[PDB]
Amino acid sequence: TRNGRDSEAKRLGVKRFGGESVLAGSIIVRQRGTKFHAGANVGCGRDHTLFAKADGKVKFEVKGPKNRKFISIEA
Amino acid sequence: MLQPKRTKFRKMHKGRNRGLAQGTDVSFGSFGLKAVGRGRLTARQIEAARRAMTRAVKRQGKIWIRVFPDKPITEKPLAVRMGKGKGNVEYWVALIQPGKVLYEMDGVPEELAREAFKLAAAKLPIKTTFVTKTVM
Amino acid sequence: FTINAEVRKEQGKGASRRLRAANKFPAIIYGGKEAPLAIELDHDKVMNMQAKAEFYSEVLTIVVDGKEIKVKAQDVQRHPYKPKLQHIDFVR
Amino acid sequence: KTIKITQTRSAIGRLPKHKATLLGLGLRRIGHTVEREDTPAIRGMINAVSFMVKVE
Amino acid sequence: DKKSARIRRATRARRKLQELGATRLVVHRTPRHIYAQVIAPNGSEVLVAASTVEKAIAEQLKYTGNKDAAAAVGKAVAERALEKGIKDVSFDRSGFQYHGRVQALADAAREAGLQF
RNA sequence: UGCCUGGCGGCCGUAGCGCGGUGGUCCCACCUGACCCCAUGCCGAACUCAGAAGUGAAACGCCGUAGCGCCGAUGGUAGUGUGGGGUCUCCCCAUGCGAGAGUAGGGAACUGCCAGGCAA
RNA sequence: GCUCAACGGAUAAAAGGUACUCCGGGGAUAACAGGCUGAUACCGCCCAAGAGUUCAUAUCGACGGCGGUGUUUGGCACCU
RNA sequence: UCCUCCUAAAGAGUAACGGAGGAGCACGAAGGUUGGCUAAUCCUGGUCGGACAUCAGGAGGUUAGUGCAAUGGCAUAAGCC
RNA sequence: GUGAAGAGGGAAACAACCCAGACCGCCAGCUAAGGUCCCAAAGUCAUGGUUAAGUGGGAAACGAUGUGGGAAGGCCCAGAC
Numbered sequence: 093t094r095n096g097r098d099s100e101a102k103r104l105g106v107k108r109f110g111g112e113s114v115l116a117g118s119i120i121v122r123q124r125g126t127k128f129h130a131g132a133n134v135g136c137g138r139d140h141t142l143f144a145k146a147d148g149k150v151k152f153e154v155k156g157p158k159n160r161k162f163i164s165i166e167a
Numbered sequence: 168m169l170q171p172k173r174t175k176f177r178k179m180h181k182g183r184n185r186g187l188a189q190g191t192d193v194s195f196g197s198f199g200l201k202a203v204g205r206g207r208l209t210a211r212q213i214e215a216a217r218r219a220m221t222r223a224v225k226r227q228g229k230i231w232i233r234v235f236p237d238k239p240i241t242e243k244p245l246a247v248r249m250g251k252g253k254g255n256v257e258y259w260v261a262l263i264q265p266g267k268v269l270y271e272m273d274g275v276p277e278e279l280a281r282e283a284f285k286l287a288a289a290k291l292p293i294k295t296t297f298v299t300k301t302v303m
Numbered sequence: 304f305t306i307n308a309e310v311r312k313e314q315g316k317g318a319s320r321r322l323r324a325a326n327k328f329p330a331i332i333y334g335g336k337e338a339p340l341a342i343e344l345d346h347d348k349v350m351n352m353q354a355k356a357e358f359y360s361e362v363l364t365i366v367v368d369g370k371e372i373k374v375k376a377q378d379v380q381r382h383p384y385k386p387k388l389q390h391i392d393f394v395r
Numbered sequence: 396k397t398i399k400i401t402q403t404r405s406a407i408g409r410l411p412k413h414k415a416t417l418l419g420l421g422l423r424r425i426g427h428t429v430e431r432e433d434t435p436a437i438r439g440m441i442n443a444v445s446f447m448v449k450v451e
Numbered sequence: 452d453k454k455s456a457r458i459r460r461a462t463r464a465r466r467k468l469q470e471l472g473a474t475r476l477v478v479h480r481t482p483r484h485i486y487a488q489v490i491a492p493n494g495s496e497v498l499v500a501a502s503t504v505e506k507a508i509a510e511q512l513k514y515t516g517n518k519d520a521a522a523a524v525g526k527a528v529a530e531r532a533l534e535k536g537i538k539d540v541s542f543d544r545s546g547f548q549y550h551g552r553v554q555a556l557a558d559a560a561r562e563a564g565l566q567f
Numbered sequence: 568u569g570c571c572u573g574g575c576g577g578c579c580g581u582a583g584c585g586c587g588g589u590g591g592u593c594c595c596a597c598c599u600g601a602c603c604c605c606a607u608g609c610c611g612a613a614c615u616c617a618g619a620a621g622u623g624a625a626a627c628g629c630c631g632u633a634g635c636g637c638c639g640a641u642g643g644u645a646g647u648g649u650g651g652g653g654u655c656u657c658c659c660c661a662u663g664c665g666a667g668a669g670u671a672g673g674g675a676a677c678u679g680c681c682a683g684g685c686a687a
Numbered sequence: 688g689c690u691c692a693a694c695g696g697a698u699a700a701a702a703g704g705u706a707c708u709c710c711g712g713g714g715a716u717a718a719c720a721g722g723c724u725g726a727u728a729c730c731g732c733c734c735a736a737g738a739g740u741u742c743a744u745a746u747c748g749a750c751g752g753c754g755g756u757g758u759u760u761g762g763c764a765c766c767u
Numbered sequence: 768u769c770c771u772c773c774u775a776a777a778g779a780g781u782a783a784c785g786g787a788g789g790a791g792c793a794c795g796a797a798g799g800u801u802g803g804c805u806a807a808u809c810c811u812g813g814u815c816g817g818a819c820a821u822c823a824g825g826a827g828g829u830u831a832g833u834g835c836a837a838u839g840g841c842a843u844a845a846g847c848c
Numbered sequence: 849g850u851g852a853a854g855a856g857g858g859a860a861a862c863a864a865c866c867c868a869g870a871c872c873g874c875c876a877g878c879u880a881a882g883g884u885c886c887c888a889a890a891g892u893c894a895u896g897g898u899u900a901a902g903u904g905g906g907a908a909a910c911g912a913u914g915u916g917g918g919a920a921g922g923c924c925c926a927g928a929c
């Protein structure tokens with residue numbers, strides 16, 4: 093054979109889903125590109141990881157012109 | 168012999184030939200050969216069945232081929248153990264679900280169409296039937 | 304060109320199969336400001352009716368509960384390989 | 396408002412969910428006429444394992 | 452089209468400033484007239500608004516489209532803003548380069564008392 | 568109160584395109600010049616400033632049109648959770664869920680907060 | 688300051704032969720034979736373009752199709 | 768050994784001597800931030816100049832670009848100054 | 849899921865297939881899968897049909913006035929086949 097190589101899987105996805113109460117700092121979505129975007133009280137790190145900026149429930153939204161998926165937190 | 172003129176990938180997965188066909192309505196020609204049975208037609212069988220029709224109906228009339236292979240079948244050489252790579256591509260097959268119009272025919276009598284389509288139907292592995300272009 | 308047909312009560316996958324395996328097949332009438340009407344009818348009539356070219360052009364009067372509804376056959380579902388009808392859509 | 400349920404088949408070659416549902420109904424062995432208060436839940440539980448229970 | 456090019460030029464500031472949750476002071480410049488409005492942190496309702504189009508300010512000055520006229524709006528916004536109870540704000544320049552009329556509006560807005 | 572404009576949103580194509588009209592009283596647009604503030608890696612084209620002779624051409628706003636895009640039932644079909652069954656590569660039955668495409672049709676948006684002008 | 692890249696790195700430092708062999712084990716793993724399978728092989732059959740002075744099916748049969756057998760070449764590694 | 772896609776059965780994970788590709792760096796501007804900008808590819812006209820260099824307008828609109836394979840992502844631009 | 853690590857009844861015999869989880873005893877009864885003419889426990893049971901091959905009790909392409917149901921379509925008293 094010529095091939096037979098593969099990388100280790102990165103464990104990327106929605107960790108905390110909509111409605112789950114999360115602590116200030118908790119990672120909501122690990123992903124590569126901004127598939128979801130950072131809404132209210134949610135950050136976006138160098139790795140495009142969407143993390144909670146404040147304590148509260150996670151809320152997925154579909155808004156804007158592009159119609160894009162945003163992630164917000166509400167106390 | 169029919170074959171895709173360049174593909175994305177050389178070797179495709181096996182898959183499962185399931186469900187019903189899509190190309191069921193007689194679109195182009197007047198008559199047509201529908202596949203009752205389920206199966207998969209090689210590139211050789213299609214060419215062998217086409218020649219049987221084209222020679223039966225002579226220079227006159229017009230024939231379509233609705234099916235095309237675009238699935239390369241791998242075959243492992245004789246006296247070779249398991250593993251040590253996926254086998255080399257030998258022949259190309261079109262997967263045929265039930266209700267698939269294989270060939271269509273136009274510009275001939277309804278008698279000679281059936282007698283020509285029988286000769287083609289005899290070449291193919293799949294069990295087939297004659298169908299006419301019903302208007303809607 | 305006078306089809307006769309009962310009204311459907313059970314509708315879905317399970318009912319439609321039990322129906323279709325009893326020499327009948329489901330169909331539907333719709334058009335205008337009124338609501339649609341689900342319509343069970345016999346197979347062996349409408350199989351023989353479609354042979355004529357007028358069927359998919361001229362107006363048909365479907366008899367339902369006494370009332371004769373004037374319609375035209377808009378769309379139709381053939382059974383994949385066996386020569387038989389599965390469903391008809393009647394536009395008003 | 397109660398309903399008498401009866402287990403009419405074995406809980407051996409069955410799914411862990413179906414083994415659990417019987418533990419949630421309270422059915423221990425085949426031929427056990429347990430009675431439970433009727434709600435939308437218990438009917439869901441009966442509908443989940445309808446093949447191996449019978450209602451009175 | 453210039454308008455649409457100027458809208459996308461501003462959008463970053465707007466979208467960044469709405470995230471922070473700050474009371475923004477929008478300023479729309481025009482060849483004739485200059486506008487200004489303090490908008491609430493939700494982004495919908497207006498708290499204070501003033502311009503050269505208003506006859507209260509237009510009646511005093513000579514022309515309604517220059518530095519000295521923009522200053523007069525710049526005072527008129529900030530003077531009202533303090534009466535309503537606003538003080539800590541941000542300045543949405545709105546795709547207009549911070550140099551002339553808008554700068555004269557901003558400096559007049561600072562010098563009046565409004566804190567930014 | 569309605570009729571119109573300007574800024575800022577919500578809502579993101581039933582809200583967008585093309586085609587047919589229409590507005591300059593104020594507003595907005597081009598427009599009128601360039602000691603200056605500033606500007607072009609050449610150019611007041613752009614950005615900028617100082618203006619009021621002109622026009623509604625372009626751009627923009629509004630009204631009308633189905634040529635498209637877009638939305639979209641009901642019914643059926645495919646798929647499938649669970650217990651069965653067969654002629655078992657593939658299907659079928661009971662029961663629960665139920666698409667996509669296509670069809671009738673709907674369809675040139677819909678609203679909020681301040682500001683200005685006109686009929687009051 | 689390490690292609691410690693055999694990349695969780697045995698040493699700072701290491702290649703071969705044995706038919707002269709030997710011990711411990713394995714049917715956890717090959718060679719014979721058996722088994723399961725039947726791509727291949729052998730044996731049938733289906734359609735009929737042509738050959739046969741004319742005339743497909745006396746004898747043949749292209750391009751293709753479907754079976755049987757376990758006589759071949761194999762695959763698997765289930766017994767030893 | 769490390770990265771990317773499928774296989775992987777709509778969270779994650781998931782094998783085979785299964786199917787395809789890459790990496791063992793690069794950069795004091797290719798980082799920061801501020802302030803700007805908009806592409807491909809054609810059409811027509813134009814000196815040498817021609818299909819294509821540079822210019823003008825029109826068409827398309829992200830087919831572009833992203834220091835490097837593939838994936839996901841970007842006009843608020845993460846694109847180019 | 850089952851065996852491994854689970855006996856018992858059935859599938860002739862048959863770890864994994866179908867039924868069902870053995871604490872011990874009894875010369876009690878009711879049922880599961882599967883069965884009911886004899887080997888061998890229990891219906892030569894009842895109603896209306898089908899098969900004529902020992903099919904049931906291995907198999908394909910393809911072949912044929914085999915034989916049952918249907919739903920249609922070609923002609924008559926000017927008398928067709």
Ligand SMILES: [Mg+2]
Pocket residue numbers: 093251252
């Ligand atoms: Mg090799």
Ligand SMILES: [Mg+2]
Pocket residue numbers: none
């Ligand atoms: Mg490996």
Ligand SMILES: [Mg+2]
Pocket residue numbers: 098099101
């Ligand atoms: Mg892996």
Ligand SMILES: [Mg+2]
Pocket residue numbers: 099100101
């Ligand atoms: Mg991966």
Ligand SMILES: [Mg+2]
Pocket residue numbers: 101
């Ligand atoms: Mg992956």
Ligand SMILES: [Mg+2]
Pocket residue numbers: 137138
């Ligand atoms: Mg940071």
Ligand SMILES: [Mg+2]
Pocket residue numbers: 180182
């Ligand atoms: Mg697959």
Ligand SMILES: [Mg+2]
Pocket residue numbers: none
């Ligand atoms: Mg398919």
Ligand SMILES: [Mg+2]
Pocket residue numbers: none
């Ligand atoms: Mg050898």
Ligand SMILES: [Mg+2]
Pocket residue numbers: 314315316
């Ligand atoms: Mg349903």
Ligand SMILES: [Mg+2]
Pocket residue numbers: 316
């Ligand atoms: Mg079902």
Ligand SMILES: [Mg+2]
Pocket residue numbers: none
């Ligand atoms: Mg267990």
Ligand SMILES: [Mg+2]
Pocket residue numbers: 453
């Ligand atoms: Mg301008």
Ligand SMILES: [Mg+2]
Pocket residue numbers: none
């Ligand atoms: Mg356009």
Ligand SMILES: [Mg+2]
Pocket residue numbers: none
């Ligand atoms: Mg100018």
Ligand SMILES: [Mg+2]
Pocket residue numbers: none
């Ligand atoms: Mg105009």
